[PDB]
Ligand binder design. Structure first.
Ligand code: FMN
Ligand code: FMN
Ligand code: FMN
Ligand code: FMN
Lengths: 172, 172, 172, 172
């Protein structure tokens, strides 16, 4: 009965997108469990392996950091061999979303790169039909970082959340 | 009641994979409509826009040519604005497959690059869970080109065909 | 003494970018040979294999068609086995550029996908440092298609042309 | 006078590749500074920002973890805004390398995904001309993990190291 909305956020932009996507999910006929991951070294409650194992589907979100997802997120996925092994996530639908400092700061490629692990877990990936890209939702935040979630972005975040939920519905 | 198995093949390697994938589809509870595309300039029956519009799901296959799909295939997709526009393929599951001259001649990247258009058409993409990659089926054919479809490759082609069909089944 | 500026264009948007990139090249200390490819089925002079073989470096441009380059371009590259074989382009610098109907219509991914063949030919690829992306130049043309080349886009086209030329200069 | 050979390794496979690449570099007319990164949570000396700032070129290596680089590596790159900002690495050549548990466990895509940050730093990327792929060196280590670096893999690691060094030489 839930879609996991899993994300990392440093200055709140991705956190905001997560919340909007969650709402999409709810109007897709599903409950949204929004969870984040702890910072690493040498907004929301923390995710555990259970949240992943028992989700019906998943939205994965990160700020774009040099064309890839953020390392606290990567670190969380890095701990999922067990799920890989017994093969959960297999068959469950998934979508990604990202926040960016420039208009063309490589969201598409960050979204691309984030679809990869989900394909390793054998999930079913989907984007947005016909920020915001065909691969998932993106938000543009400016060098400033303060630019708030605009009209179409917020709308697209919800569309994705919804589509994800309905897909999880269809698959039963 | 059909999955479209759409491919281009020049010396038969991809044609063979198409046939094996078709069989997977049949054992997934669906009929396989195998279709190819005509060579361009300046194995199977030709595909038409109808085959695409009315499929329940789709397998797309091409030999890897410099990291991308073959241009006769690309040319066929290039003619699908109309479907894009009214938004068919939207919601329907899809998977890719490729044939290669070397072990690591970039199948993954060709498969990647082929998933892109399907995401532009708003399809749901899936690979192989836990040649053959997590992104779709690949066959290794050698510089020679004669190396035939091996045991695990043939098995993986069928798995994909099947998974595709069952997914299309689940989505109803 | 020349950089090949090789592109396909259907309604002139990419043709325009090619010209702007050519100018960048000239101010990089090199002559720009701008060439296109003939349409296929079943702006500039046509490119031949000689243009490729004897260039010092290369800019490759196409409209984004479903996340990939256009099939007339692909068809031209499809005819370069011979060069692949004897290994020209090996060592020579390359960059890409693309034109798009939407803001986030997948330029990055089209640019990505276009870098792939150049890597198969063993070229050295470069983007834009610190439309327009880090992977190459993009132009946004609108659903309309009439939106002309804007200030920063035109500037970025030239930067790339220049950087390409200077790199080819450095490599000697 | 040095190429930075920067990598993360957990069970030594990537560490081995780093060493072989280093040797390639030396025979390319350059000194190889091999450096790793510390594990994160919530083989070689550690890299510092200085190693990056003052390298003439760079090889980046990681085990493939779900289609992406390892999070300790990502975390190190995650700390390079400053270099991004003042624009070092800009103009310097770069190549990647990866180690994998399966034959087609997505090295190409991991290599791809690793080229992305280097393009954000405005480096010049190169692969292998005409494991081992056109995008960089890969090693196959088996589910076991014990499979040692084979003949052609070891040879390809050196080729890349060498090509990288010579390129850095040419650029001066
Ligand atoms: C080290 C790091 C790398 C970044 N790399 C990029 C990038 O390559 N392209 C871009 O547009 N923005 C980049 N940014 C900006 C972030 O994407 C931006 O801060 C993000 O929208 C904030 O997300 P958050 O508020 O959820 O933490 C980077 C930021 C950091 C801290
Ligand atoms: C122009 C062209 C480009 C090719 N590029 C690659 C490549 O980059 N990597 C590779 O491993 N094989 C490459 N090949 C080999 C084909 O992938 C191989 O012939 C394929 O398996 C045959 O597929 P088919 O029999 O269905 O036509 C290329 C072949 C042609 C004709
Ligand atoms: C069949 C085809 C596919 C296209 N696919 C996309 C696409 O996926 N994303 C996008 O933004 N625009 C897409 N477009 C719009 C083109 O990218 C746009 O027309 C381009 O800027 C024109 O380039 P040209 O004038 O050089 O021919 C497509 C156009 C055609 C004809
Ligand atoms: C969590 C994690 C994720 C992994 N993901 C993949 C993968 O998707 N594909 C693959 O072939 N191997 C995968 N592996 C295997 C590693 O790539 C393999 O252990 C690597 O060759 C070891 O590198 P190292 O000895 O330098 O640490 C993964 C291993 C770990 C620990």
């Amino acid at each position: 009965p839930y879609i996991l909305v899993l994300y990392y956020s440093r200055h709140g932009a991705t956190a905001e997108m997560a919340r909007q996507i969650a709402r999409g999910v709810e109007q897709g006929g599903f409950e949204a469990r929004v969870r984040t991951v702890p910072a690493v070294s040498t907004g929301a409650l923390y995710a555990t392996l259970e949240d992943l194992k028992n989700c019906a589907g998943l939205a994965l979100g990160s700020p774009t950091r040099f064309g890839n997802m953020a390392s606290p997120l990567k670190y969380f996925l890095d701990g999922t061999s067990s799920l890989w092994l017994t093969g959960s996530l297999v068959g469950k639908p998934a979508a990604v979303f990202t926040s960016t400092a420039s208009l063309h700061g490589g969201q598409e490629t960050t979204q691309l790169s984030m679809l990869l692990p989900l394909l390793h877990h054998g999930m079913l990936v989907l984007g947005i039909p016909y920020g915001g890209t065909p691969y998932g939702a993106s938000h543009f935040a400016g060098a400033d970082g303060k630019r708030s979630l605009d009209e179409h972005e917020l709308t697209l975040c919800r569309a994705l959340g919804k589509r994800l939920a309905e897909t999880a519905g269809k698959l039963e």
